[PDB]
mmCIF file of C-alpha atoms and ligand atoms in Angstrom:
data_model
loop_
_atom_site.group_PDB
_atom_site.id
_atom_site.type_symbol
_atom_site.label_atom_id
_atom_site.label_comp_id
_atom_site.label_asym_id
_atom_site.label_seq_id
_atom_site.Cartn_x
_atom_site.Cartn_y
_atom_site.Cartn_z
ATOM 1 C CA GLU A 2 -0.026 -0.120 0.436
ATOM 2 C CA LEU A 3 1.423 3.015 -0.787
ATOM 3 C CA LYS A 4 -0.472 6.967 -0.271
ATOM 4 C CA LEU A 5 0.263 9.671 -2.973
ATOM 5 C CA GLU A 6 1.413 12.566 -1.233
ATOM 6 C CA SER A 7 2.339 14.912 -4.249
ATOM 7 C CA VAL A 8 2.066 15.320 -8.180
ATOM 8 C CA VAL A 9 3.845 17.719 -10.801
ATOM 9 C CA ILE A 10 2.639 17.354 -14.314
ATOM 10 C CA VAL A 11 4.547 18.962 -16.858
ATOM 11 C CA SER A 12 2.343 19.685 -19.855
ATOM 12 C CA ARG A 13 3.244 20.428 -23.389
ATOM 13 C CA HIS A 14 0.551 23.003 -24.443
ATOM 14 C CA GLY A 15 -2.606 21.885 -26.332
ATOM 15 C CA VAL A 16 -3.209 21.685 -30.321
ATOM 16 C CA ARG A 17 -1.869 24.567 -32.284
ATOM 17 C CA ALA A 18 -1.991 26.599 -35.727
ATOM 18 C CA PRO A 19 1.213 26.131 -37.416
ATOM 19 C CA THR A 20 3.677 29.126 -36.127
ATOM 20 C CA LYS A 21 4.764 29.888 -39.586
ATOM 21 C CA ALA A 22 3.768 29.336 -43.068
ATOM 22 C CA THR A 23 6.829 29.901 -45.689
ATOM 23 C CA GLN A 24 7.865 29.794 -49.053
ATOM 24 C CA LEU A 25 9.554 26.677 -48.518
ATOM 25 C CA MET A 26 5.889 24.839 -47.419
ATOM 26 C CA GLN A 27 4.827 25.822 -50.348
ATOM 27 C CA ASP A 28 6.663 24.534 -52.690
ATOM 28 C CA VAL A 29 7.133 21.280 -52.039
ATOM 29 C CA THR A 30 3.393 19.752 -52.555
ATOM 30 C CA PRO A 31 1.260 21.308 -55.675
ATOM 31 C CA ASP A 32 -1.490 21.498 -52.799
ATOM 32 C CA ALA A 33 -2.942 23.784 -50.633
ATOM 33 C CA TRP A 34 -2.181 24.213 -46.582
ATOM 34 C CA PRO A 35 -5.672 24.346 -45.046
ATOM 35 C CA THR A 36 -5.861 27.140 -42.953
ATOM 36 C CA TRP A 37 -6.459 27.473 -39.049
ATOM 37 C CA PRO A 38 -9.045 28.814 -36.956
ATOM 38 C CA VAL A 39 -6.824 31.083 -34.795
ATOM 39 C CA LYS A 40 -3.603 33.595 -35.754
ATOM 40 C CA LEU A 41 -0.052 31.920 -36.066
ATOM 41 C CA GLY A 42 0.741 29.864 -32.781
ATOM 42 C CA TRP A 43 -2.176 30.374 -31.380
ATOM 43 C CA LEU A 44 -4.325 27.274 -29.216
ATOM 44 C CA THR A 45 -7.277 26.251 -30.972
ATOM 45 C CA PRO A 46 -10.533 25.734 -29.259
ATOM 46 C CA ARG A 47 -10.442 22.145 -29.551
ATOM 47 C CA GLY A 48 -6.860 22.198 -28.489
ATOM 48 C CA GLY A 49 -8.499 23.983 -25.579
ATOM 49 C CA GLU A 50 -11.107 21.129 -24.971
ATOM 50 C CA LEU A 51 -8.762 18.448 -25.505
ATOM 51 C CA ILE A 52 -6.412 20.084 -22.405
ATOM 52 C CA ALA A 53 -9.343 20.320 -20.233
ATOM 53 C CA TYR A 54 -10.469 16.545 -21.105
ATOM 54 C CA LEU A 55 -6.832 15.855 -19.229
ATOM 55 C CA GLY A 56 -7.691 18.298 -16.148
ATOM 56 C CA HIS A 57 -11.038 16.871 -15.870
ATOM 57 C CA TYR A 58 -9.962 12.707 -15.779
ATOM 58 C CA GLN A 59 -7.557 13.762 -13.521
ATOM 59 C CA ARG A 60 -9.641 15.087 -11.062
ATOM 60 C CA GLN A 61 -11.156 12.153 -11.553
ATOM 61 C CA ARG A 62 -8.105 9.943 -10.511
ATOM 62 C CA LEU A 63 -6.698 12.656 -7.836
ATOM 63 C CA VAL A 64 -10.032 12.070 -5.942
ATOM 64 C CA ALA A 65 -9.987 8.568 -6.125
ATOM 65 C CA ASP A 66 -6.023 8.616 -4.726
ATOM 66 C CA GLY A 67 -7.252 10.464 -1.876
ATOM 67 C CA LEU A 68 -5.334 13.671 -2.884
ATOM 68 C CA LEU A 69 -8.012 16.185 -3.560
ATOM 69 C CA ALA A 70 -12.180 16.871 -2.899
ATOM 70 C CA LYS A 71 -14.504 14.546 -4.975
ATOM 71 C CA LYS A 72 -17.019 18.174 -4.396
ATOM 72 C CA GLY A 73 -16.714 21.628 -4.183
ATOM 73 C CA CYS A 74 -12.786 23.635 -5.386
ATOM 74 C CA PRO A 75 -9.105 23.097 -4.127
ATOM 75 C CA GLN A 76 -8.386 25.164 -1.481
ATOM 76 C CA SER A 77 -5.706 28.086 -0.952
ATOM 77 C CA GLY A 78 -2.582 26.870 -2.926
ATOM 78 C CA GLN A 79 -3.548 23.151 -2.966
ATOM 79 C CA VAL A 80 -3.285 23.218 -6.875
ATOM 80 C CA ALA A 81 -0.920 25.539 -8.407
ATOM 81 C CA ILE A 82 -0.462 26.432 -11.825
ATOM 82 C CA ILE A 83 2.552 27.701 -13.657
ATOM 83 C CA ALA A 84 2.719 28.418 -17.426
ATOM 84 C CA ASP A 85 5.094 29.838 -19.677
ATOM 85 C CA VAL A 86 4.259 33.431 -21.773
ATOM 86 C CA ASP A 87 3.023 31.823 -24.998
ATOM 87 C CA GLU A 88 -0.475 32.307 -25.333
ATOM 88 C CA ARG A 89 -0.742 28.611 -26.139
ATOM 89 C CA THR A 90 0.796 27.852 -22.737
ATOM 90 C CA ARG A 91 -1.094 30.573 -20.428
ATOM 91 C CA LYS A 92 -4.161 29.158 -22.458
ATOM 92 C CA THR A 93 -3.516 25.241 -21.669
ATOM 93 C CA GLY A 94 -2.754 26.423 -17.502
ATOM 94 C CA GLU A 95 -6.855 28.363 -18.058
ATOM 95 C CA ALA A 96 -8.126 24.815 -20.076
ATOM 96 C CA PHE A 97 -6.502 22.495 -17.541
ATOM 97 C CA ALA A 98 -7.768 24.358 -14.464
ATOM 98 C CA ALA A 99 -11.449 24.654 -16.000
ATOM 99 C CA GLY A 100 -11.202 20.944 -16.335
ATOM 100 C CA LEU A 101 -9.643 19.990 -13.115
ATOM 101 C CA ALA A 102 -11.986 22.149 -11.236
ATOM 102 C CA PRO A 103 -14.236 24.082 -13.542
ATOM 103 C CA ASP A 104 -15.745 27.575 -11.828
ATOM 104 C CA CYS A 105 -12.536 27.371 -9.539
ATOM 105 C CA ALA A 106 -10.942 30.271 -11.603
ATOM 106 C CA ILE A 107 -7.661 28.811 -10.266
ATOM 107 C CA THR A 108 -4.699 31.673 -11.325
ATOM 108 C CA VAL A 109 -2.492 30.538 -13.893
ATOM 109 C CA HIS A 110 0.691 32.170 -12.992
ATOM 110 C CA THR A 111 3.338 33.606 -15.127
ATOM 111 C CA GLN A 112 6.557 35.367 -15.219
ATOM 112 C CA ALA A 113 5.765 38.870 -14.635
ATOM 113 C CA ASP A 114 6.429 40.540 -18.372
ATOM 114 C CA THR A 115 4.720 37.752 -20.976
ATOM 115 C CA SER A 116 5.677 39.747 -23.882
ATOM 116 C CA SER A 117 9.539 38.588 -23.402
ATOM 117 C CA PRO A 118 10.647 34.707 -22.727
ATOM 118 C CA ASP A 119 10.610 32.780 -19.673
ATOM 119 C CA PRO A 120 13.732 31.418 -18.500
ATOM 120 C CA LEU A 121 12.161 28.847 -16.406
ATOM 121 C CA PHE A 122 11.511 27.233 -19.960
ATOM 122 C CA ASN A 123 14.960 27.436 -21.999
ATOM 123 C CA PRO A 124 17.557 29.233 -19.520
ATOM 124 C CA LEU A 125 19.858 29.226 -22.817
ATOM 125 C CA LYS A 126 17.098 31.569 -24.934
ATOM 126 C CA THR A 127 17.532 34.832 -22.048
ATOM 127 C CA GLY A 128 21.821 33.706 -21.732
ATOM 128 C CA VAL A 129 21.538 32.399 -18.229
ATOM 129 C CA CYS A 130 24.188 29.815 -19.446
ATOM 130 C CA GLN A 131 25.654 28.462 -22.851
ATOM 131 C CA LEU A 132 25.550 25.274 -24.561
ATOM 132 C CA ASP A 133 29.505 23.749 -25.440
ATOM 133 C CA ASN A 134 29.497 23.784 -29.132
ATOM 134 C CA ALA A 135 32.043 21.008 -29.563
ATOM 135 C CA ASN A 136 30.496 18.774 -27.390
ATOM 136 C CA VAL A 137 27.480 19.312 -28.281
ATOM 137 C CA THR A 138 28.050 18.671 -31.936
ATOM 138 C CA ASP A 139 30.210 15.331 -31.392
ATOM 139 C CA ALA A 140 27.067 14.543 -29.020
ATOM 140 C CA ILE A 141 24.438 14.741 -31.963
ATOM 141 C CA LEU A 142 26.650 13.660 -34.818
ATOM 142 C CA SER A 143 27.116 10.648 -33.230
ATOM 143 C CA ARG A 144 23.600 9.898 -32.532
ATOM 144 C CA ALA A 145 22.533 10.645 -35.673
ATOM 145 C CA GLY A 146 24.804 7.411 -36.352
ATOM 146 C CA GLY A 147 27.852 9.697 -37.385
ATOM 147 C CA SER A 148 26.846 12.185 -39.862
ATOM 148 C CA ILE A 149 23.137 13.697 -40.971
ATOM 149 C CA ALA A 150 23.802 12.546 -44.278
ATOM 150 C CA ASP A 151 23.912 8.764 -42.176
ATOM 151 C CA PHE A 152 20.870 9.765 -40.555
ATOM 152 C CA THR A 153 18.541 10.435 -44.059
ATOM 153 C CA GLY A 154 20.339 7.399 -44.972
ATOM 154 C CA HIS A 155 18.103 5.258 -43.000
ATOM 155 C CA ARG A 156 15.085 7.094 -42.688
ATOM 156 C CA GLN A 157 14.529 7.356 -47.048
ATOM 157 C CA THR A 158 11.549 4.990 -46.348
ATOM 158 C CA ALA A 159 9.755 7.575 -44.103
ATOM 159 C CA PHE A 160 11.211 10.241 -46.498
ATOM 160 C CA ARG A 161 9.172 8.636 -49.515
ATOM 161 C CA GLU A 162 6.246 8.179 -47.282
ATOM 162 C CA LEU A 163 6.029 11.989 -46.895
ATOM 163 C CA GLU A 164 7.178 12.824 -50.681
ATOM 164 C CA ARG A 165 4.082 10.727 -51.576
ATOM 165 C CA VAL A 166 1.877 12.633 -49.105
ATOM 166 C CA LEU A 167 3.506 16.131 -50.429
ATOM 167 C CA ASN A 168 2.885 14.623 -54.075
ATOM 168 C CA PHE A 169 6.752 16.129 -53.594
ATOM 169 C CA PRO A 170 7.129 14.911 -57.440
ATOM 170 C CA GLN A 171 4.363 17.394 -58.212
ATOM 171 C CA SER A 172 5.864 20.394 -56.578
ATOM 172 C CA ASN A 173 7.105 23.449 -57.787
ATOM 173 C CA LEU A 174 10.863 22.717 -55.703
ATOM 174 C CA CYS A 175 10.335 19.301 -58.644
ATOM 175 C CA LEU A 176 9.229 20.396 -61.622
ATOM 176 C CA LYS A 177 10.895 23.638 -61.780
ATOM 177 C CA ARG A 178 14.404 21.786 -61.510
ATOM 178 C CA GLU A 179 16.867 21.999 -64.398
ATOM 179 C CA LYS A 180 16.995 19.279 -65.824
ATOM 180 C CA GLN A 181 14.876 16.334 -64.776
ATOM 181 C CA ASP A 182 17.118 13.244 -66.091
ATOM 182 C CA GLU A 183 17.099 12.640 -62.427
ATOM 183 C CA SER A 184 14.816 11.784 -59.372
ATOM 184 C CA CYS A 185 12.813 13.943 -56.779
ATOM 185 C CA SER A 186 14.551 13.575 -53.913
ATOM 186 C CA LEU A 187 13.302 15.830 -50.599
ATOM 187 C CA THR A 188 16.698 14.678 -48.583
ATOM 188 C CA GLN A 189 18.983 15.614 -52.055
ATOM 189 C CA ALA A 190 16.743 18.615 -52.767
ATOM 190 C CA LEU A 191 17.352 20.200 -49.453
ATOM 191 C CA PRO A 192 20.397 19.051 -47.833
ATOM 192 C CA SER A 193 20.641 18.797 -43.836
ATOM 193 C CA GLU A 194 23.819 20.019 -41.872
ATOM 194 C CA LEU A 195 23.598 20.295 -37.513
ATOM 195 C CA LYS A 196 24.079 24.081 -37.058
ATOM 196 C CA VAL A 197 25.240 24.586 -33.428
ATOM 197 C CA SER A 198 25.562 27.713 -31.198
ATOM 198 C CA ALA A 199 26.076 28.967 -27.784
ATOM 199 C CA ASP A 200 22.357 28.882 -27.416
ATOM 200 C CA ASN A 201 20.482 26.752 -29.905
ATOM 201 C CA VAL A 202 20.589 23.602 -31.769
ATOM 202 C CA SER A 203 18.753 23.491 -35.076
ATOM 203 C CA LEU A 204 19.503 21.049 -38.181
ATOM 204 C CA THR A 205 18.638 23.000 -41.738
ATOM 205 C CA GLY A 206 16.930 21.338 -44.930
ATOM 206 C CA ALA A 207 15.278 18.652 -45.494
ATOM 207 C CA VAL A 208 15.732 17.358 -41.419
ATOM 208 C CA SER A 209 13.705 20.032 -40.067
ATOM 209 C CA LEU A 210 11.022 20.550 -42.753
ATOM 210 C CA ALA A 211 10.217 16.789 -42.417
ATOM 211 C CA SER A 212 10.105 17.181 -38.233
ATOM 212 C CA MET A 213 7.729 20.146 -38.853
ATOM 213 C CA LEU A 214 5.686 18.873 -41.364
ATOM 214 C CA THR A 215 4.512 15.795 -40.409
ATOM 215 C CA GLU A 216 3.572 17.417 -37.272
ATOM 216 C CA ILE A 217 1.361 19.935 -39.236
ATOM 217 C CA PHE A 218 -0.390 16.591 -40.881
ATOM 218 C CA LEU A 219 -1.128 15.241 -37.156
ATOM 219 C CA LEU A 220 -2.116 19.030 -35.566
ATOM 220 C CA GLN A 221 -4.656 18.343 -38.783
ATOM 221 C CA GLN A 222 -5.692 15.068 -37.714
ATOM 222 C CA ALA A 223 -6.053 16.128 -33.586
ATOM 223 C CA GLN A 224 -7.867 19.364 -34.364
ATOM 224 C CA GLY A 225 -10.905 17.219 -36.683
ATOM 225 C CA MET A 226 -9.937 18.780 -40.219
ATOM 226 C CA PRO A 227 -11.594 16.767 -43.122
ATOM 227 C CA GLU A 228 -9.057 15.316 -44.493
ATOM 228 C CA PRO A 229 -5.073 15.477 -43.022
ATOM 229 C CA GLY A 230 -2.742 15.740 -45.732
ATOM 230 C CA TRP A 231 -5.503 15.940 -48.731
ATOM 231 C CA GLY A 232 -6.493 12.928 -47.774
ATOM 232 C CA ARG A 233 -3.081 10.694 -48.519
ATOM 233 C CA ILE A 234 -3.089 9.581 -44.945
ATOM 234 C CA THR A 235 -4.994 6.266 -44.272
ATOM 235 C CA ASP A 236 -3.947 4.053 -41.909
ATOM 236 C CA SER A 237 -1.574 3.936 -38.698
ATOM 237 C CA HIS A 238 0.889 2.291 -40.353
ATOM 238 C CA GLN A 239 1.385 5.659 -42.383
ATOM 239 C CA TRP A 240 0.775 8.131 -39.323
ATOM 240 C CA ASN A 241 3.832 5.920 -37.842
ATOM 241 C CA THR A 242 6.093 6.368 -40.521
ATOM 242 C CA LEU A 243 5.494 9.472 -40.785
ATOM 243 C CA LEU A 244 6.018 11.041 -37.460
ATOM 244 C CA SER A 245 9.081 8.994 -37.071
ATOM 245 C CA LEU A 246 10.732 11.850 -38.963
ATOM 246 C CA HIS A 247 9.364 14.844 -36.093
ATOM 247 C CA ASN A 248 10.653 12.025 -32.646
ATOM 248 C CA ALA A 249 13.823 11.442 -35.035
ATOM 249 C CA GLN A 250 15.018 15.302 -34.543
ATOM 250 C CA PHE A 251 13.751 15.994 -31.285
ATOM 251 C CA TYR A 252 15.806 12.407 -30.593
ATOM 252 C CA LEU A 253 18.958 14.487 -31.791
ATOM 253 C CA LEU A 254 17.965 17.823 -31.181
ATOM 254 C CA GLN A 255 16.549 17.990 -27.166
ATOM 255 C CA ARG A 256 16.840 14.774 -26.060
ATOM 256 C CA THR A 257 20.593 14.345 -26.448
ATOM 257 C CA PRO A 258 21.647 15.291 -23.133
ATOM 258 C CA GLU A 259 24.684 17.744 -23.753
ATOM 259 C CA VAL A 260 21.817 19.574 -24.822
ATOM 260 C CA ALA A 261 18.817 18.485 -22.705
ATOM 261 C CA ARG A 262 21.031 18.663 -18.979
ATOM 262 C CA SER A 263 21.194 22.307 -19.441
ATOM 263 C CA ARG A 264 18.363 23.427 -20.955
ATOM 264 C CA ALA A 265 16.055 21.470 -18.566
ATOM 265 C CA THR A 266 17.827 22.171 -15.132
ATOM 266 C CA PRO A 267 15.315 25.758 -14.047
ATOM 267 C CA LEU A 268 12.501 22.838 -14.930
ATOM 268 C CA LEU A 269 14.640 19.857 -13.097
ATOM 269 C CA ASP A 270 15.106 22.917 -10.048
ATOM 270 C CA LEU A 271 11.181 23.673 -9.948
ATOM 271 C CA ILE A 272 10.114 19.445 -9.958
ATOM 272 C CA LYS A 273 12.670 18.809 -7.057
ATOM 273 C CA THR A 274 11.084 21.674 -5.163
ATOM 274 C CA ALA A 275 7.662 21.010 -5.689
ATOM 275 C CA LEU A 276 8.360 17.404 -4.315
ATOM 276 C CA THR A 277 10.367 17.437 -1.989
ATOM 277 C CA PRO A 278 8.536 17.626 1.714
ATOM 278 C CA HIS A 279 9.381 20.664 3.333
ATOM 279 C CA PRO A 280 7.472 23.350 5.267
ATOM 280 C CA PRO A 281 5.319 25.317 2.826
ATOM 281 C CA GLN A 282 7.089 28.678 1.439
ATOM 282 C CA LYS A 283 6.581 30.961 -1.370
ATOM 283 C CA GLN A 284 8.701 30.955 -3.847
ATOM 284 C CA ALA A 285 8.559 31.334 -8.334
ATOM 285 C CA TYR A 286 5.890 33.015 -9.463
ATOM 286 C CA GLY A 287 4.649 33.811 -6.039
ATOM 287 C CA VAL A 288 3.612 29.951 -5.594
ATOM 288 C CA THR A 289 4.268 28.143 -2.305
ATOM 289 C CA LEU A 290 5.577 25.295 -2.434
ATOM 290 C CA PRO A 291 5.465 22.286 -1.672
ATOM 291 C CA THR A 292 1.885 21.832 -2.416
ATOM 292 C CA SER A 293 -1.153 18.627 -3.453
ATOM 293 C CA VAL A 294 -1.010 19.854 -7.311
ATOM 294 C CA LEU A 295 1.213 21.426 -9.838
ATOM 295 C CA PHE A 296 0.472 21.966 -13.394
ATOM 296 C CA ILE A 297 3.421 23.556 -15.829
ATOM 297 C CA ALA A 298 2.168 24.420 -18.864
ATOM 298 C CA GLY A 299 5.319 24.355 -21.894
ATOM 299 C CA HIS A 300 6.531 22.827 -24.600
ATOM 300 C CA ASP A 301 7.443 19.089 -26.594
ATOM 301 C CA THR A 302 10.849 20.370 -26.348
ATOM 302 C CA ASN A 303 10.378 20.616 -22.133
ATOM 303 C CA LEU A 304 9.186 17.299 -22.337
ATOM 304 C CA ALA A 305 12.049 16.111 -24.520
ATOM 305 C CA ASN A 306 14.994 17.599 -22.126
ATOM 306 C CA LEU A 307 13.083 16.159 -19.291
ATOM 307 C CA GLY A 308 13.163 12.505 -20.598
ATOM 308 C CA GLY A 309 17.031 12.998 -21.985
ATOM 309 C CA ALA A 310 18.329 14.600 -18.440
ATOM 310 C CA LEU A 311 17.216 11.897 -16.256
ATOM 311 C CA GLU A 312 16.798 9.233 -18.817
ATOM 312 C CA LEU A 313 13.141 8.305 -19.391
ATOM 313 C CA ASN A 314 12.521 6.863 -22.395
ATOM 314 C CA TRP A 315 9.158 6.198 -23.919
ATOM 315 C CA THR A 316 6.900 5.418 -26.967
ATOM 316 C CA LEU A 317 2.930 6.243 -26.871
ATOM 317 C CA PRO A 318 0.794 3.555 -28.124
ATOM 318 C CA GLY A 319 -1.597 4.752 -30.381
ATOM 319 C CA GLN A 320 0.031 8.467 -30.185
ATOM 320 C CA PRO A 321 2.432 8.365 -33.381
ATOM 321 C CA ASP A 322 4.643 11.809 -31.638
ATOM 322 C CA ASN A 323 6.023 11.249 -28.825
ATOM 323 C CA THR A 324 6.059 14.730 -27.799
ATOM 324 C CA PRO A 325 2.359 15.220 -28.911
ATOM 325 C CA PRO A 326 -0.424 18.107 -28.114
ATOM 326 C CA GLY A 327 -1.337 17.793 -24.142
ATOM 327 C CA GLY A 328 1.269 15.405 -23.076
ATOM 328 C CA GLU A 329 1.977 14.801 -19.880
ATOM 329 C CA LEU A 330 5.544 14.059 -17.840
ATOM 330 C CA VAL A 331 3.932 12.966 -14.791
ATOM 331 C CA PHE A 332 5.775 12.985 -11.014
ATOM 332 C CA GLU A 333 4.286 11.677 -8.004
ATOM 333 C CA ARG A 334 5.671 11.350 -4.421
ATOM 334 C CA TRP A 335 4.305 8.654 -2.684
ATOM 335 C CA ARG A 336 4.437 7.683 0.312
ATOM 336 C CA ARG A 337 4.473 3.765 1.630
ATOM 337 C CA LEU A 338 3.351 3.121 4.760
ATOM 338 C CA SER A 339 5.024 -0.041 5.754
ATOM 339 C CA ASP A 340 7.771 1.794 6.648
ATOM 340 C CA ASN A 341 6.270 5.457 5.446
ATOM 341 C CA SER A 342 9.457 5.889 3.244
ATOM 342 C CA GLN A 343 9.152 8.118 0.018
ATOM 343 C CA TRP A 344 9.456 7.383 -3.346
ATOM 344 C CA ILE A 345 8.720 9.391 -7.022
ATOM 345 C CA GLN A 346 7.178 7.686 -9.968
ATOM 346 C CA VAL A 347 7.037 8.868 -13.512
ATOM 347 C CA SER A 348 4.778 8.519 -15.816
ATOM 348 C CA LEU A 349 3.476 9.503 -19.616
ATOM 349 C CA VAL A 350 0.028 10.661 -19.963
ATOM 350 C CA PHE A 351 -1.301 11.029 -23.248
ATOM 351 C CA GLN A 352 -4.198 11.556 -25.446
ATOM 352 C CA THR A 353 -4.253 8.714 -28.333
ATOM 353 C CA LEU A 354 -4.419 10.149 -31.844
ATOM 354 C CA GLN A 355 -7.956 8.418 -32.490
ATOM 355 C CA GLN A 356 -8.499 10.089 -28.385
ATOM 356 C CA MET A 357 -7.786 13.246 -29.718
ATOM 357 C CA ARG A 358 -9.571 12.917 -33.400
ATOM 358 C CA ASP A 359 -12.418 11.680 -31.966
ATOM 359 C CA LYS A 360 -12.789 14.174 -29.504
ATOM 360 C CA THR A 361 -13.321 11.776 -26.323
ATOM 361 C CA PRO A 362 -14.001 12.973 -23.145
ATOM 362 C CA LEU A 363 -11.942 11.034 -20.941
ATOM 363 C CA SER A 364 -12.681 9.723 -17.509
ATOM 364 C CA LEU A 365 -11.756 6.625 -15.142
ATOM 365 C CA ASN A 366 -13.591 3.713 -17.687
ATOM 366 C CA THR A 367 -12.156 6.113 -20.868
ATOM 367 C CA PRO A 368 -9.050 7.087 -19.939
ATOM 368 C CA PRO A 369 -5.719 8.485 -21.696
ATOM 369 C CA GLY A 370 -2.875 6.266 -22.658
ATOM 370 C CA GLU A 371 -0.652 5.994 -20.333
ATOM 371 C CA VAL A 372 3.275 4.662 -19.656
ATOM 372 C CA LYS A 373 4.545 3.547 -16.724
ATOM 373 C CA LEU A 374 8.707 5.146 -16.694
ATOM 374 C CA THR A 375 11.610 4.142 -15.435
ATOM 375 C CA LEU A 376 14.417 6.515 -14.106
ATOM 376 C CA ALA A 377 17.702 4.241 -15.936
ATOM 377 C CA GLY A 378 20.240 5.881 -13.190
ATOM 378 C CA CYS A 379 17.995 4.851 -9.873
ATOM 379 C CA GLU A 380 20.665 2.972 -8.021
ATOM 380 C CA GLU A 381 17.241 2.273 -5.089
ATOM 381 C CA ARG A 382 14.093 1.406 -6.354
ATOM 382 C CA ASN A 383 10.640 -0.133 -5.177
ATOM 383 C CA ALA A 384 8.881 -3.005 -5.883
ATOM 384 C CA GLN A 385 6.577 -0.897 -7.934
ATOM 385 C CA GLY A 386 9.569 0.399 -10.166
ATOM 386 C CA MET A 387 9.983 4.276 -8.290
ATOM 387 C CA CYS A 388 13.188 5.543 -7.411
ATOM 388 C CA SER A 389 13.663 6.356 -3.807
ATOM 389 C CA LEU A 390 13.172 10.156 -2.872
ATOM 390 C CA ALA A 391 17.284 10.187 -2.005
ATOM 391 C CA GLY A 392 18.004 8.452 -5.434
ATOM 392 C CA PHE A 393 15.584 10.543 -7.016
ATOM 393 C CA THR A 394 17.565 13.866 -5.426
ATOM 394 C CA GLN A 395 21.043 12.438 -6.314
ATOM 395 C CA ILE A 396 19.832 11.887 -9.934
ATOM 396 C CA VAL A 397 18.394 15.446 -10.611
ATOM 397 C CA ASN A 398 21.620 16.584 -8.634
ATOM 398 C CA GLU A 399 23.905 14.972 -11.162
ATOM 399 C CA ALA A 400 21.743 16.089 -14.443
ATOM 400 C CA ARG A 401 20.872 19.697 -13.647
ATOM 401 C CA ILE A 402 23.647 22.016 -14.734
ATOM 402 C CA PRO A 403 24.955 24.558 -11.550
ATOM 403 C CA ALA A 404 25.159 27.419 -14.146
ATOM 404 C CA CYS A 405 22.036 27.101 -15.998
ATOM 405 C CA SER A 406 20.275 27.319 -12.715
ATOM 406 C CA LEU A 407 17.928 30.507 -12.398
HETATM 407 MG MG1 MG B 10 -5.117 5.100 -8.133
HETATM 408 MG MG1 MG B 11 -0.319 34.017 -7.215
HETATM 409 NI NI1 NI B 12 5.752 16.279 -31.231
#
C-alpha cells in the first residue's frame, strides 16, 4: 500500500495553429495547405477542449487517489499552475484548470513580463548559460549515426512516405529543377546540416522541414480537419512512419543530454522543489511549494529535455508523436505505508491520436494513454519500480547544470 502525497505535471500545450507558413512549405507540394481558425501559434478552441478533458480525468483519478476532494474547489494553493508566457501555454493552463476544477478560477501564474521569454522554459534563450559547442556537435552527430547523411540514409522509407503525402514529384521544387534527367528527393533537394551555437541547436533542410510538416499533419488530424495530408494518410502505419521523422529530430536536438541537461535545469529545480517535503513556502511566481498538485504548461522541447536529462525513454502506443499536444510527464511522490518511506514515480500520460481525432471525453472508464517510466540511473527502487526520494534527489543533482539555474 502506497499513499499519493504530491503530483507535478509538466504538460505540452494543446493543439495549436502552425507557427509559420513559408514559401518552402508551398514549394514542396502542388496542393494548398488548409487554413486554421486562429492566429499563427495560438491554441485552438478544440485544443483547449482536449486539455480540459485531461484536467477532468486528472481530477477523477486524484479524487480516487485521495489527494483532492470529490466536491468543491481545492483550497488555498492546494493546486498551483505555472505557464510559459506564450498564448498557447497560458491558455493550456486555463483549459486544464477548467477541466480540473470548473468555475474555480484557479490562477494561471506566469512571469511578470509576458512579452519576453521565461528562462524557466529554456535558460539558453535569455543567456543564463551556454552550450558547449564542440561537445554538443560531437554528441548529436554520434547519435545521428555519425553524420546527418547517415541519419537520413536510414530514414529514406519515411522520407518517401512524406513525399507521397506531399505529392512531392508534382511540386514546384520538383518541377522547376533543371534538368529532369534525375529523380526528385527531399533529402537531396534540401541538404541537411547540424548548426550549433551557444544558445541553440538546429537542423537545416529536409530534416527540419520533415519534422515540422509531419507534425502539421498530426495537428490537422487532432484538430478534426476533414482530410489531413490532402486525404493521403489513410492508416496507422502511415501515421507512425510520418511522425518518426519528427521524433527523430527531437531525439537528436532535444533528447541529447549535452543539450537536454542544460536546457532542462530550471525545470529540474522547480520539479525537485515541488516534490521535496518541506514547510510550505512562497517561491517562484509567488506560488507556495510544496503543495498537492502543480501543473506546468510548457512545450514539446521541455518534455524531450526532461526525458533526456533524467534518462526516461518512451514510445506512446496509439500516439505517433512522442511529444504530443497535451502530453504530460507526471511526477508523483508516494509514501509507502509499511515504513513511511518516500518514493518518486514518473509516467507519460497522453491522448491517443484517435482520442484526439474523435474528441473523446476522458474519465476513469475511458482514460488517456499512460506509460510507466523508469529512471535508468536509479539505484534504489521499490517493488513498483519507483525511485527513492534520495535516489531521485541524487539523479537530479547529478543531471542538472549549476550554471543554468535561475
Ligand atoms: Mg489510483
Ligand atoms: Mg499568485
Ligand atoms: Ni511532438
